[PDB]
PDB file of C-alpha atoms in Angstrom:
ATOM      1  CA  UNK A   1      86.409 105.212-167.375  1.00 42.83           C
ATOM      2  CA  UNK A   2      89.087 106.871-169.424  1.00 44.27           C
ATOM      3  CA  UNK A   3      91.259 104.990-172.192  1.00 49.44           C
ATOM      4  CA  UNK A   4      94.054 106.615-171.962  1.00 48.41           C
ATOM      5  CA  UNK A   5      95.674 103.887-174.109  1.00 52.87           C
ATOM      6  CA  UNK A   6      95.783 104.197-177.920  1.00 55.11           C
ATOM      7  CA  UNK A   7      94.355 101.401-179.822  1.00 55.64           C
ATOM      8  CA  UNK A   8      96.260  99.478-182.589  1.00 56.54           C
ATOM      9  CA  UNK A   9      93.140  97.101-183.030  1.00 57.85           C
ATOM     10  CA  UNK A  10      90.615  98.660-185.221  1.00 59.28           C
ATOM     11  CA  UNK A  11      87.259  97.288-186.453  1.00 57.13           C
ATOM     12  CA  UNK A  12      86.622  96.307-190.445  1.00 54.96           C
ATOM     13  CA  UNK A  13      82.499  97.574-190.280  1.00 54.03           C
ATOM     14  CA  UNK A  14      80.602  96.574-193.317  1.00 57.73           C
ATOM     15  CA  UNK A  15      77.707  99.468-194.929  1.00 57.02           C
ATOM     16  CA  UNK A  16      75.591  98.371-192.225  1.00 57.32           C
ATOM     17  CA  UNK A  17      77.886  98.881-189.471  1.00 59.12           C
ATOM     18  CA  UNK A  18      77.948  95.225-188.386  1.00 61.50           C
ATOM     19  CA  UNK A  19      81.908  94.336-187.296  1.00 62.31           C
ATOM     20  CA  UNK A  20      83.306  91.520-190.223  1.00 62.97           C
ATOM     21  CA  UNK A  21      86.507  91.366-188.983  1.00 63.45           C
ATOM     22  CA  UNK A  22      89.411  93.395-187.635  1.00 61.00           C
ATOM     23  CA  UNK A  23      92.671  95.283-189.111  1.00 61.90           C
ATOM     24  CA  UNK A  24      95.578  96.053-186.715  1.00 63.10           C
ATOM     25  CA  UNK A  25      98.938  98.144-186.642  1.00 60.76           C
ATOM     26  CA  UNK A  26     102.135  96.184-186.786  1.00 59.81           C
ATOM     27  CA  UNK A  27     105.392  96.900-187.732  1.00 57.93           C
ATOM     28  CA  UNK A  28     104.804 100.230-189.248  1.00 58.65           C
ATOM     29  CA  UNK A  29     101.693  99.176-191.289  1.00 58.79           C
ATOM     30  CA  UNK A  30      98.088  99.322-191.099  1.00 57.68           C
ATOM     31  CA  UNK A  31      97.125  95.953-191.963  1.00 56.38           C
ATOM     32  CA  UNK A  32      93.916  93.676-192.254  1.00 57.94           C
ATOM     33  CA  UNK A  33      92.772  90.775-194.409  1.00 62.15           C
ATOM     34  CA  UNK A  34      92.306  91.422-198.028  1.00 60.53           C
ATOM     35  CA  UNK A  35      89.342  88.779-197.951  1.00 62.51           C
ATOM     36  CA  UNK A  36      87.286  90.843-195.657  1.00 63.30           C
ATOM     37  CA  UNK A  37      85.520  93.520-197.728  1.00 63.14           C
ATOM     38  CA  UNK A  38      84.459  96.638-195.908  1.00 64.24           C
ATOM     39  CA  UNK A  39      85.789  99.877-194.247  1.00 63.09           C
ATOM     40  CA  UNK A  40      88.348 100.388-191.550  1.00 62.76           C
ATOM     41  CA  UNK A  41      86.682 102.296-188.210  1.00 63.65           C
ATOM     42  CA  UNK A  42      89.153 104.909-188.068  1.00 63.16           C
ATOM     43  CA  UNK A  43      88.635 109.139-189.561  1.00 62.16           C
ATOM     44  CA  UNK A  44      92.501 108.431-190.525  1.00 62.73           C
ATOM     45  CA  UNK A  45      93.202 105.253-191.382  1.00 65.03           C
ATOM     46  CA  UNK A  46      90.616 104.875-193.896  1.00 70.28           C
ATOM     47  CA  UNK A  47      91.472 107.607-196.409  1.00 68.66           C
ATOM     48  CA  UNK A  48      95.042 105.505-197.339  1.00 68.53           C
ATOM     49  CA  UNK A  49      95.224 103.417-200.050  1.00 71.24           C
ATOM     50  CA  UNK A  50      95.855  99.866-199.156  1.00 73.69           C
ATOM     51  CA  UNK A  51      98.289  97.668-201.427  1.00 77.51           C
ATOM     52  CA  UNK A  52      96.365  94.515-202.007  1.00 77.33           C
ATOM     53  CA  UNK A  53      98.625  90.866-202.059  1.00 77.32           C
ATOM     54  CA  UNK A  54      96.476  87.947-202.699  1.00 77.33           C
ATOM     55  CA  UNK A  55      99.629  85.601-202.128  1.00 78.44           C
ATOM     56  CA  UNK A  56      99.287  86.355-198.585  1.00 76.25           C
ATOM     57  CA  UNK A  57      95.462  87.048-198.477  1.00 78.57           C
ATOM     58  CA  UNK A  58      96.631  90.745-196.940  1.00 78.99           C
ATOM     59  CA  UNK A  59      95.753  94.432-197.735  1.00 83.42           C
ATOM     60  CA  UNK A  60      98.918  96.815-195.974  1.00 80.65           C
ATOM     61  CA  UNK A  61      99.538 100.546-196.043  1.00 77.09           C
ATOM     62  CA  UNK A  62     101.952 102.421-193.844  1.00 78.49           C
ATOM     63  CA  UNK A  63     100.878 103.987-190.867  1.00 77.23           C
ATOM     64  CA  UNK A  64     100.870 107.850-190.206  1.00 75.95           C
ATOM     65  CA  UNK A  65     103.859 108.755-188.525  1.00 72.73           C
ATOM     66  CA  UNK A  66     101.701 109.475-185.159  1.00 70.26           C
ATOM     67  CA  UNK A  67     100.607 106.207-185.167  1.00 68.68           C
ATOM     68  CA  UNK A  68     103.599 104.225-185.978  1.00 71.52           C
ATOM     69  CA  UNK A  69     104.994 104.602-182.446  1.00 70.10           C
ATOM     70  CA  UNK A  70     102.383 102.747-180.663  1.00 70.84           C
ATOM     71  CA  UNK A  71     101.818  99.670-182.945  1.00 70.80           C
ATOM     72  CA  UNK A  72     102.817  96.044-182.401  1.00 73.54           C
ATOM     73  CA  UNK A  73     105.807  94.163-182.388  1.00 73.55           C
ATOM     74  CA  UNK A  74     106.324  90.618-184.130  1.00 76.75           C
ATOM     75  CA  UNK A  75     108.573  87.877-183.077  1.00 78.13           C
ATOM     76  CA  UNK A  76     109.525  85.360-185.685  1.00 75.89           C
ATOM     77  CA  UNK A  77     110.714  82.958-182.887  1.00 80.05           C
ATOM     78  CA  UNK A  78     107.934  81.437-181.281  1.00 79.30           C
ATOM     79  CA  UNK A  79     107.987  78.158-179.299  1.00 76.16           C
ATOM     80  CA  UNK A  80     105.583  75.036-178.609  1.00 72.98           C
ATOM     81  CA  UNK A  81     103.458  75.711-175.545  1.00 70.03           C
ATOM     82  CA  UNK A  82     100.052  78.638-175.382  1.00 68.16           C
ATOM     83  CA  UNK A  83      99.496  81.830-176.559  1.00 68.74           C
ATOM     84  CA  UNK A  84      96.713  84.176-176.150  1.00 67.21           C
ATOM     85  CA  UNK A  85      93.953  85.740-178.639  1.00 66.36           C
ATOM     86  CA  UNK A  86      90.928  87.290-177.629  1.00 67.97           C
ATOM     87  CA  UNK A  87      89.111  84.216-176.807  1.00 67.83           C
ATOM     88  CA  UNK A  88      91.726  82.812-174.228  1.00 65.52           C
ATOM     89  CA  UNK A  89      94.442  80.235-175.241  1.00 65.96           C
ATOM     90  CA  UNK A  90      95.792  79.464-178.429  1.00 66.87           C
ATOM     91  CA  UNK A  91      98.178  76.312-178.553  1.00 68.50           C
ATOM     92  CA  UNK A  92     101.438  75.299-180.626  1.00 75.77           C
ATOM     93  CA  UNK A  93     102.069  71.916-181.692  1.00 75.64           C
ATOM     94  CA  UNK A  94     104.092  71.662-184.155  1.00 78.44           C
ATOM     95  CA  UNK A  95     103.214  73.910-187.018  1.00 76.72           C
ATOM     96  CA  UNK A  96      99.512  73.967-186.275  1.00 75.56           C
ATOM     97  CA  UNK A  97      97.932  76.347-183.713  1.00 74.51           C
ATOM     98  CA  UNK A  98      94.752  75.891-182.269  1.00 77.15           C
ATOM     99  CA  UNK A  99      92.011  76.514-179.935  1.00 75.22           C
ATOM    100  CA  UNK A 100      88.847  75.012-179.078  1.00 72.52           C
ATOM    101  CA  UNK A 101      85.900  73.852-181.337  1.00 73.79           C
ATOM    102  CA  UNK A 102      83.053  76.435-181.428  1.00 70.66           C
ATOM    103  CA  UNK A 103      85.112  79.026-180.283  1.00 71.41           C
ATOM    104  CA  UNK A 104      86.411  81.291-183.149  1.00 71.80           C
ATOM    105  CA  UNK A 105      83.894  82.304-186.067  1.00 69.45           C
ATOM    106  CA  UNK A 106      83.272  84.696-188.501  1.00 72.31           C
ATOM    107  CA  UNK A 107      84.773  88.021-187.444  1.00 71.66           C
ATOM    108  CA  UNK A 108      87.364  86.894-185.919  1.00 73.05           C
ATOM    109  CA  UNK A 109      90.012  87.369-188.600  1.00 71.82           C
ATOM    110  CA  UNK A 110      92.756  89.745-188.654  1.00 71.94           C
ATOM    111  CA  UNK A 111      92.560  88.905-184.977  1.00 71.56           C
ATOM    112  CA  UNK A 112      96.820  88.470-183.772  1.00 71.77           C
ATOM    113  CA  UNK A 113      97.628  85.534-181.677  1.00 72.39           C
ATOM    114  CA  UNK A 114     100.108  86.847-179.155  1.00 73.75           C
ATOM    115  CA  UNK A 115     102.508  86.131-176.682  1.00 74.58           C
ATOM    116  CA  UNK A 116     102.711  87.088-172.572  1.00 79.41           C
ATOM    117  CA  UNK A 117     105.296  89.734-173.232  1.00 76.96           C
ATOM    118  CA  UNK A 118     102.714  91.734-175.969  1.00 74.86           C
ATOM    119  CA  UNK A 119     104.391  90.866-179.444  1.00 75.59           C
ATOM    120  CA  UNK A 120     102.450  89.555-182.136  1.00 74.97           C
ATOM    121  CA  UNK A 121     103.382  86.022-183.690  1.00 74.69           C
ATOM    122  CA  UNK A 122     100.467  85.348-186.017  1.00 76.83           C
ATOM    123  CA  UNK A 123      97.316  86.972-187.616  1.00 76.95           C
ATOM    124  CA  UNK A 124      94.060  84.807-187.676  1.00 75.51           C
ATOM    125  CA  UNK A 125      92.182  84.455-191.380  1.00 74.53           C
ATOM    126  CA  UNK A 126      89.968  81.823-190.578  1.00 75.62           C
ATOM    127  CA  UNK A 127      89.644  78.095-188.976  1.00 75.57           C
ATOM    128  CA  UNK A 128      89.526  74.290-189.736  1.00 74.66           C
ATOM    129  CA  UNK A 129      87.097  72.618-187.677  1.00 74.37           C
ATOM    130  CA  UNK A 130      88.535  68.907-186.763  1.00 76.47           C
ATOM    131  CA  UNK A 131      85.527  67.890-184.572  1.00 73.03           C
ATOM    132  CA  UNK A 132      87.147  68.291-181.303  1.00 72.86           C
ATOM    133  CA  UNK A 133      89.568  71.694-181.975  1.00 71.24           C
ATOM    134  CA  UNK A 134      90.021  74.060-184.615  1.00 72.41           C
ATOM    135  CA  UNK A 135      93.253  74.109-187.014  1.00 73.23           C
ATOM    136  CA  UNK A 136      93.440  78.081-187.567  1.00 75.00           C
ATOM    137  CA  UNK A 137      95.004  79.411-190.792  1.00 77.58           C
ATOM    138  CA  UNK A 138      97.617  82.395-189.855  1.00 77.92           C
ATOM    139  CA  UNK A 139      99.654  84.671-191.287  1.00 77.57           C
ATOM    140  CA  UNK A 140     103.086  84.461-189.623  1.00 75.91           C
ATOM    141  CA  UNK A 141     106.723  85.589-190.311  1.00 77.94           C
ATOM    142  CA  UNK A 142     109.955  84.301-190.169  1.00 79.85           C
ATOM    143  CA  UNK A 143     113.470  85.560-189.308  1.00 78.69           C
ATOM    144  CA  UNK A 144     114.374  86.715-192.465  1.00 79.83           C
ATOM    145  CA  UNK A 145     111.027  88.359-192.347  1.00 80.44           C
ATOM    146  CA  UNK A 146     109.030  86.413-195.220  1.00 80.02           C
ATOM    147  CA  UNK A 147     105.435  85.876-195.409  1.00 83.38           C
ATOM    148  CA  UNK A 148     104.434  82.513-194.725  1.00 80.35           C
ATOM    149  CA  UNK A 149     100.740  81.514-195.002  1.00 81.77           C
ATOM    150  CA  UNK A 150      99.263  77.744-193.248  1.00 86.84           C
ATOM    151  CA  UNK A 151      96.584  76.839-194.375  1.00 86.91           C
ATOM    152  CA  UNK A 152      94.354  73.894-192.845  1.00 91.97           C
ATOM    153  CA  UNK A 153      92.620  71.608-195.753  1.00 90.94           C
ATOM    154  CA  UNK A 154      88.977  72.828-194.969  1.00 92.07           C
ATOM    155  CA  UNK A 155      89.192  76.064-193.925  1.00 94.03           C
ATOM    156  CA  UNK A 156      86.418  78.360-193.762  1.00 95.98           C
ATOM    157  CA  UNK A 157      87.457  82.011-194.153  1.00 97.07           C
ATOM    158  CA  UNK A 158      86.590  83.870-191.323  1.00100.69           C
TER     159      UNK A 158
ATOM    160  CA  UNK B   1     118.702  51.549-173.849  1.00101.98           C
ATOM    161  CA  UNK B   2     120.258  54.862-172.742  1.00103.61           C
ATOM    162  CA  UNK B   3     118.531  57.962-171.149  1.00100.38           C
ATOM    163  CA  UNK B   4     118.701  61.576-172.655  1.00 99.35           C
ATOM    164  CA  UNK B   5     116.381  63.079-171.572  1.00101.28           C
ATOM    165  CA  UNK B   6     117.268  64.895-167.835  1.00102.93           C
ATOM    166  CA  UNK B   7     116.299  63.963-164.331  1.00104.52           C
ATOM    167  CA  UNK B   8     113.975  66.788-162.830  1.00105.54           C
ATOM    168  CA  UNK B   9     110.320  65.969-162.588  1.00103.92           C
ATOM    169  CA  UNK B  10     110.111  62.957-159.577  1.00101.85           C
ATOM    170  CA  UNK B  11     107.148  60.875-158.336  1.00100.70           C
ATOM    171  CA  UNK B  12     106.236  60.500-154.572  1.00103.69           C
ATOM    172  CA  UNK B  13     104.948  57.608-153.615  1.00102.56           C
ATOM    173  CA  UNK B  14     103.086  56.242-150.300  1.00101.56           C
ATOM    174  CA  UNK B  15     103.568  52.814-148.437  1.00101.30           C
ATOM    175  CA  UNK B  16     101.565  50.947-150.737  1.00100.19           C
ATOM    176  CA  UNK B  17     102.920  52.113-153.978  1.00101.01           C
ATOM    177  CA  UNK B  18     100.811  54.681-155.355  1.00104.48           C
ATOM    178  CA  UNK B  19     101.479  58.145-156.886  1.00105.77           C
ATOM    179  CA  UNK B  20     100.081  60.822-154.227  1.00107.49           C
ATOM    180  CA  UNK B  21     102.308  63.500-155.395  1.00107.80           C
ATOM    181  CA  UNK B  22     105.250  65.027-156.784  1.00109.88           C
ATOM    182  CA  UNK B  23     108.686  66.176-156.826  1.00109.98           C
ATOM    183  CA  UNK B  24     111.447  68.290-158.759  1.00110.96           C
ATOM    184  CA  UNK B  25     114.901  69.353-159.202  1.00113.53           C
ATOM    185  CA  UNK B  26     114.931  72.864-159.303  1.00112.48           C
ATOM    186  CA  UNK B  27     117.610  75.995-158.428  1.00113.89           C
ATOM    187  CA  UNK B  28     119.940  73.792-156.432  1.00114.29           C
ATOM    188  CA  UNK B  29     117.249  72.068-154.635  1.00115.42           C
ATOM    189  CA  UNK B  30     114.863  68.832-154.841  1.00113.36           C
ATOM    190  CA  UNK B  31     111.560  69.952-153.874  1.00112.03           C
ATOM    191  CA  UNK B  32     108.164  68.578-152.212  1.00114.83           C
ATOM    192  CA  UNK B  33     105.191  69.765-150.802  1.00114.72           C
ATOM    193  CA  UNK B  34     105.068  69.026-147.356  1.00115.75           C
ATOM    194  CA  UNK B  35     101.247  67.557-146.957  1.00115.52           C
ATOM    195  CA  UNK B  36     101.819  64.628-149.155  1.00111.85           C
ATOM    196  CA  UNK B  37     102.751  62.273-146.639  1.00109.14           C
ATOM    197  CA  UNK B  38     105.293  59.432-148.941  1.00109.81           C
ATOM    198  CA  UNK B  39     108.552  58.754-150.259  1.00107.05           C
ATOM    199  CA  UNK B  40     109.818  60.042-153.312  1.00109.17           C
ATOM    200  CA  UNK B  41     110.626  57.195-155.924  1.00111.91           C
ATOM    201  CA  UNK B  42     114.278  58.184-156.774  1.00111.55           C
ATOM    202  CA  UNK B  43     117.643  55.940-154.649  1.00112.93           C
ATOM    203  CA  UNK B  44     119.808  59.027-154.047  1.00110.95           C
ATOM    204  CA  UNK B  45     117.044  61.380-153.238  1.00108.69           C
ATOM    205  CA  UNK B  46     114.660  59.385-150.933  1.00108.09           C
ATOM    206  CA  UNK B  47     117.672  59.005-148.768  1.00111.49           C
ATOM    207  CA  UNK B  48     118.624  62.747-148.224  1.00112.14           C
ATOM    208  CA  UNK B  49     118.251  64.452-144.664  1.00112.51           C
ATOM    209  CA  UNK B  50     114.896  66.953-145.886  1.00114.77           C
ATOM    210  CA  UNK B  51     114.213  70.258-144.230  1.00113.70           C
ATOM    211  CA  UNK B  52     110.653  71.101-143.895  1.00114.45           C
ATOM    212  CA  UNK B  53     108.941  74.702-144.014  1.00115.46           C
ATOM    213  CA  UNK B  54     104.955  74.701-143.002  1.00114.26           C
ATOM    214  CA  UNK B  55     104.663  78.165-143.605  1.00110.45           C
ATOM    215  CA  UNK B  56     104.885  77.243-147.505  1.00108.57           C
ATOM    216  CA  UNK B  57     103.912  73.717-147.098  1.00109.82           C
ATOM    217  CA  UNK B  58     107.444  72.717-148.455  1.00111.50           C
ATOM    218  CA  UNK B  59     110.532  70.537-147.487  1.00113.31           C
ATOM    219  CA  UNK B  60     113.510  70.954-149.503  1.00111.39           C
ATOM    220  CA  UNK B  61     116.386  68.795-149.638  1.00111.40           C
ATOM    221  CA  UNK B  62     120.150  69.812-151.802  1.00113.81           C
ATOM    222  CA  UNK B  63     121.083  68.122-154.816  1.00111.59           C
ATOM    223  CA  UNK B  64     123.897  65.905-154.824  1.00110.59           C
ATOM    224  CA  UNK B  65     126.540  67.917-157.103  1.00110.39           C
ATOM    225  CA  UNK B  66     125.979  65.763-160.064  1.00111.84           C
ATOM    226  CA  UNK B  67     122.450  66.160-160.114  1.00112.90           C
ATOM    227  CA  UNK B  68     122.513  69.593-159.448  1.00116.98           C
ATOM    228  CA  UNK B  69     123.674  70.044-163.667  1.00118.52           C
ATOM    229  CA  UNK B  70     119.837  68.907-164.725  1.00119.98           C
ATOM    230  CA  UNK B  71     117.770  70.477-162.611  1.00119.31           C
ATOM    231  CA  UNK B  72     115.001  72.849-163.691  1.00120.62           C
ATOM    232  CA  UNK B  73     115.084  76.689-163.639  1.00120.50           C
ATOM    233  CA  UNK B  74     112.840  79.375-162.269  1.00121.46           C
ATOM    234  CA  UNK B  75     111.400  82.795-163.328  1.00121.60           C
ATOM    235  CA  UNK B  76     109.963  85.570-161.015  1.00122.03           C
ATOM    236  CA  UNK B  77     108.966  87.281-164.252  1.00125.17           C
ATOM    237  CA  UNK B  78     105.122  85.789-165.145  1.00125.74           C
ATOM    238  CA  UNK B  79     103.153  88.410-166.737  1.00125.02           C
ATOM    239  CA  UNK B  80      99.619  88.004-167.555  1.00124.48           C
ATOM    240  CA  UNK B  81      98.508  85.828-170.145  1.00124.98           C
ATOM    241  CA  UNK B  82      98.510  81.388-170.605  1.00127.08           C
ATOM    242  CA  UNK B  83     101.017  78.840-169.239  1.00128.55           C
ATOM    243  CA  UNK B  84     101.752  75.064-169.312  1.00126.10           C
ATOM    244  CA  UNK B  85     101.088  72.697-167.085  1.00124.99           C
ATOM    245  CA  UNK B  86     100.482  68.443-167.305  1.00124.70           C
ATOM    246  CA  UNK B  87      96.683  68.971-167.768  1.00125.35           C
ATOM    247  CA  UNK B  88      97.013  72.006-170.659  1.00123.45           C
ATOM    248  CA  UNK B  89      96.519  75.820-170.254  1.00127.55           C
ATOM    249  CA  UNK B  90      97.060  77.235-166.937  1.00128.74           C
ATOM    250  CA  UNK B  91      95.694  81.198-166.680  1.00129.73           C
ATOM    251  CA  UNK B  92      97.256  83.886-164.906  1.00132.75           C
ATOM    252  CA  UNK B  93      95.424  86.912-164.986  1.00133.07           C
ATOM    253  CA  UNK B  94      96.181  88.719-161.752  1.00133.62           C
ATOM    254  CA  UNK B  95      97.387  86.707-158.901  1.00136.33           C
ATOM    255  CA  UNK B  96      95.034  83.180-159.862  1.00135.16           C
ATOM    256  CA  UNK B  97      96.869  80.919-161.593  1.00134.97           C
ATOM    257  CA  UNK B  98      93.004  79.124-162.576  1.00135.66           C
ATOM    258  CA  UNK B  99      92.393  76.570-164.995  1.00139.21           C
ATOM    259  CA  UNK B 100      89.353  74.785-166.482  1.00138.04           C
ATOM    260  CA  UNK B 101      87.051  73.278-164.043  1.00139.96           C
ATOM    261  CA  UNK B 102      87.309  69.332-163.654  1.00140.18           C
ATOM    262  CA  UNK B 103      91.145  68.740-164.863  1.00141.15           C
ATOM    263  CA  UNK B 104      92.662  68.964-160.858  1.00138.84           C
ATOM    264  CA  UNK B 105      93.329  66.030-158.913  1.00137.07           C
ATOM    265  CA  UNK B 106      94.778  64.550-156.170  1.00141.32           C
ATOM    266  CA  UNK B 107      97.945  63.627-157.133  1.00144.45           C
ATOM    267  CA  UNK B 108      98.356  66.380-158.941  1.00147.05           C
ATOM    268  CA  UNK B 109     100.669  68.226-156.260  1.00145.34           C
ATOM    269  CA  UNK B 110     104.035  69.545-156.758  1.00145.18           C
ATOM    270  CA  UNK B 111     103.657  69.709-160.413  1.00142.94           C
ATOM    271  CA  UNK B 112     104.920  72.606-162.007  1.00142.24           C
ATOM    272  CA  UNK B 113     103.377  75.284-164.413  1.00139.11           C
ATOM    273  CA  UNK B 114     105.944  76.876-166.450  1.00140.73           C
ATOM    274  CA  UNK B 115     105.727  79.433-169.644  1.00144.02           C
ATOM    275  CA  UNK B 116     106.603  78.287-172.916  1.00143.46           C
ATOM    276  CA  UNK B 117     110.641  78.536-172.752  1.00141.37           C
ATOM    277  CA  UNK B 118     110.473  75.871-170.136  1.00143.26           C
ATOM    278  CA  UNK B 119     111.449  77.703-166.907  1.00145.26           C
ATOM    279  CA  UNK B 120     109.239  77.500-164.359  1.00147.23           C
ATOM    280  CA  UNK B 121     107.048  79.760-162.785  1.00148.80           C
ATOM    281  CA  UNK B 122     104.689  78.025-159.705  1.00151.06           C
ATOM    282  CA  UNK B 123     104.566  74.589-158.036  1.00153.10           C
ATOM    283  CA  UNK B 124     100.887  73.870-157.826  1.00153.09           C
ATOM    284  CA  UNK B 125      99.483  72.912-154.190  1.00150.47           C
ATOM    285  CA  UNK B 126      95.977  72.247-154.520  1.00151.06           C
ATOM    286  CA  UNK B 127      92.397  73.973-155.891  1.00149.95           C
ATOM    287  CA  UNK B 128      89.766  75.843-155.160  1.00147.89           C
ATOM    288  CA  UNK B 129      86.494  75.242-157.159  1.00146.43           C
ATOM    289  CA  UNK B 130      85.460  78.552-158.220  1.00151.41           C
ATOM    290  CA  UNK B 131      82.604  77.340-160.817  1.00153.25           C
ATOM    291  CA  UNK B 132      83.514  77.213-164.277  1.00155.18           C
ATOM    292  CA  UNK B 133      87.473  77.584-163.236  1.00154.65           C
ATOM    293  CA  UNK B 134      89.672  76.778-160.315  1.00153.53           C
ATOM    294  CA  UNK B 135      92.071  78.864-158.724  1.00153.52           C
ATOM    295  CA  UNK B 136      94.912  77.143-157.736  1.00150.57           C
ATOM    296  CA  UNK B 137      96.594  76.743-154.472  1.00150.78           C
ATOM    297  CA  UNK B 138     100.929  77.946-155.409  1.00148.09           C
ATOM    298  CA  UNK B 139     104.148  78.528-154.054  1.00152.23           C
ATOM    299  CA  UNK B 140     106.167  81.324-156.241  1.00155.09           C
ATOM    300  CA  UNK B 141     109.362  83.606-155.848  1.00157.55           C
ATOM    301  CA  UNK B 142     108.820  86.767-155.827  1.00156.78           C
ATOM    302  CA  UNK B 143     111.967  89.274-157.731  1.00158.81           C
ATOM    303  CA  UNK B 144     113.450  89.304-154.776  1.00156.85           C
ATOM    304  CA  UNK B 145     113.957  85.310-153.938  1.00160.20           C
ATOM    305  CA  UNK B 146     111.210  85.141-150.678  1.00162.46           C
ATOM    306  CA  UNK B 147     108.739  82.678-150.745  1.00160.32           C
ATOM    307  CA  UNK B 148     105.120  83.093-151.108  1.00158.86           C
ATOM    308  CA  UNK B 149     102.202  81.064-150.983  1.00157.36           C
ATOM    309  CA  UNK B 150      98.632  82.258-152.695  1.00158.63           C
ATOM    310  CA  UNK B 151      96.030  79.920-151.113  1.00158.41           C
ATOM    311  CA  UNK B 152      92.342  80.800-153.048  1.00160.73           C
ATOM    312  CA  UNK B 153      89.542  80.431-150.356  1.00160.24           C
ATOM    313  CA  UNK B 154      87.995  76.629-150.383  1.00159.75           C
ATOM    314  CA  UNK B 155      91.433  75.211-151.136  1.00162.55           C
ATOM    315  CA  UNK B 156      91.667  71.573-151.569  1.00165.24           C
ATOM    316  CA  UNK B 157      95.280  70.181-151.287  1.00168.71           C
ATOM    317  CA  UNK B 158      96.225  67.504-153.901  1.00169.49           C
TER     318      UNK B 158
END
């Protein structure tokens, strides 16, 4: 089976080599949680220097120009209805997106939560249980292009 | 007292007064499936001459040239990835449109499942218990305007 598709989700692996989360190539950037502490699977992108920002709970560094070609695309607009992560469907209600109870967990942060044409519209840091679905705490964008941050009361970093 | 909101999404009821199925204003057309066997709950509409077509268990009727300004629109363009529907999250991940086991129903016919800028994208038939999911039974235009019907083996209508 040959992947002749070049990735733009890459694994965060601790000293053990267990997976704690994900980084991912958007926009020009290499970027992944700050929260999550450990390495970045890649010979390339692990030798940059990342440019911590605690406001946003983000670590960034630009992309080799090889790479910046096939990375995501974000879309500030982004309307009520579903949109997909790893896990299946991911739903809008008015400022809050969420998905099932149970369903998301530890690892699962700097996972995007995208739309059915392929552009990003969030990044997942971690989740809010509410007994019957989770309130997940993104990282999203707006038109002008600044960095907002929601997070749930409760949330458990992921 | 006044009504904003548009006139698109009708009822079809039997000779007893219950909901069996329903109806919509869509593309220059009202729109039913064909098996439910009742009258659709709307003065001007009930009492239009309606042209039947087996072959994708519809009958379509024109809308009266005022109408015809709130009617719904279609897309031919559904990638892969989550929809809406009445019940929630409708999946499309090449040619099923399933969704979660238990949430079909009689009644439940001629609904629509559209993507999250409101246009829709399949008028539900009927389902097909596949285990865990269902794959529904759906009439869709193709990007060239024909018809086509994907019935799932096991079909129930609704």
């Amino acid at each position: 089976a040959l992947k002749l598709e070049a990735d733009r989700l890459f694994d965060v692996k601790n000293e053990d080599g267990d997976v704690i989360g994900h980084a991912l190539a958007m926009e020009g950037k290499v970027m992944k949680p700050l929260h999550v502490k450990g390495t970045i699977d890649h010979p390339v992108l692990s030798k940059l220097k990342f440019t911590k920002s605690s406001a946003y709970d983000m670590e960034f560094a630009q992309l080799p120009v090889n790479m910046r070609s096939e990375a995501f695309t974000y879309t500030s607009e982004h309307p009520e209805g579903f949109y997909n992560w790893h896990h299946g469907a991911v739903q809008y209600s008015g400022g809050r997106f969420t998905i099932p109870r149970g369903v998301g967990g530890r690892g699962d942060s700097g996972r995007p939560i995208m739309d059915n044409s392929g552009r990003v519209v969030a990044i997942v840091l971690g989740g809010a249980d509410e007994g019957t679905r989770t309130a997940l705490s993104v990282v999203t964008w707006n038109s002008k292009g600044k960095t907002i941050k929601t997070t749930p009361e409760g949330t458990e970093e992921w």
